[PDB]
């Protein structure tokens, strides 16, 4: 209907609760392995944030896997920063991590993150 | 870190994708039964929006159920309107449905929805 009212803060309040569930390991259904490191998450949140995870978890075989191994070239700290961004909207971008965050966001297919990384690098040239 | 940047639209863009997954029946993990009607959903979204579903899906036995039956007094249209609100932030509140939406929101423990229903009823007295 075109006669709906809207609760402004609803989407933000939902995302905060999804991050609380992740913190407490409640109903997490996949482990992402990045070299020696492991990260527990919810497949639906990963798909909602990333073109790579959307493709993986809509595949008729990969949708049922409980472990996904990323390319060995991916930096674990870069992945951790992006997983935190998926669950909070906040990106911890610093001089010391920007190259790893940008390469990881290109692999994960997160376009707006790639674009702000490019802008911050260009400003320092 | 206190040095994070924030993408304003991120939470809203995530919620839109969760509703698209529900529309296409992708990775839905529970059926909610309301008398003769059935509704497919994601347990994590239900818990993030409702005090009743948060209690149900954190229980050591009920967390593993694939079907949940609601009280026979609950109106299916009232439940459908609230499920759509959970996945969109938009509430289709009308003269013809407000009493059923308010009773359903009290049962589901959705406080801000109960509060706007009370305000709209009081204005018509």
């Amino acid at each position: 209907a075109d006669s709906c009212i809207q609760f402004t803060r609803h989407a933000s309040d939902v995302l905060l609760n999804l991050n609380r569930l992740r913190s407490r390991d409640i109903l997490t259904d996949v482990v992402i392995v990045v070299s020696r490191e492991q990260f527990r998450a919810h497949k639906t949140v990963l798909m909602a944030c990333s073109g790579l995870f959307y493709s993986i978890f809509t595949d008729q075989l990969k949708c049922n896997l409980s472990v996904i191994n990323l390319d060995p070239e991916i930096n674990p700290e870069g992945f951790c920063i992006l997983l935190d961004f998926m669950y909070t909207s906040r990106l911890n971008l610093r001089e010391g991590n920007i190259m790893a965050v940008m390469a990881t966001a290109m692999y994960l297919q997160m376009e707006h993150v790639v674009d702000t990384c490019r802008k911050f690098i260009k400003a320092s040239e | 870190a206190d040095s994070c940047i924030q993408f304003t639209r991120h939470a809203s863009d995530v919620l839109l994708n969760l509703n698209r997954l529900r529309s296409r029946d992708i990775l839905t993990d529970v059926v909610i039964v309301v008398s003769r009607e059935q509704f497919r959903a994601h347990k994590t979204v239900l818990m993030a929006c409702s005090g009743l579903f948060y209690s149900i899906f954190t229980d050591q036995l009920k967390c593993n159920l694939s079907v949940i039956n609601l009280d026979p007094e609950i109106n299916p249209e009232g439940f459908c309107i609230l499920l759509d609100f959970m996945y969109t932030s938009r509430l289709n509140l009308r003269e013809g449905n407000i009493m059923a939406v308010m009773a359903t929101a009290m049962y589901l423990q959705m406080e801000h929805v109960v509060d706007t229903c009370r305000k709209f009823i009081k204005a018509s007295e």
Binding site: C4, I5, Q6, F7, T8 | R90
Partner: peptide
């Protein structure tokens, strides 16, 4: 909160 979207 509530608004007209």
């Amino acid at each position: 909160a509530w608004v007209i979207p």
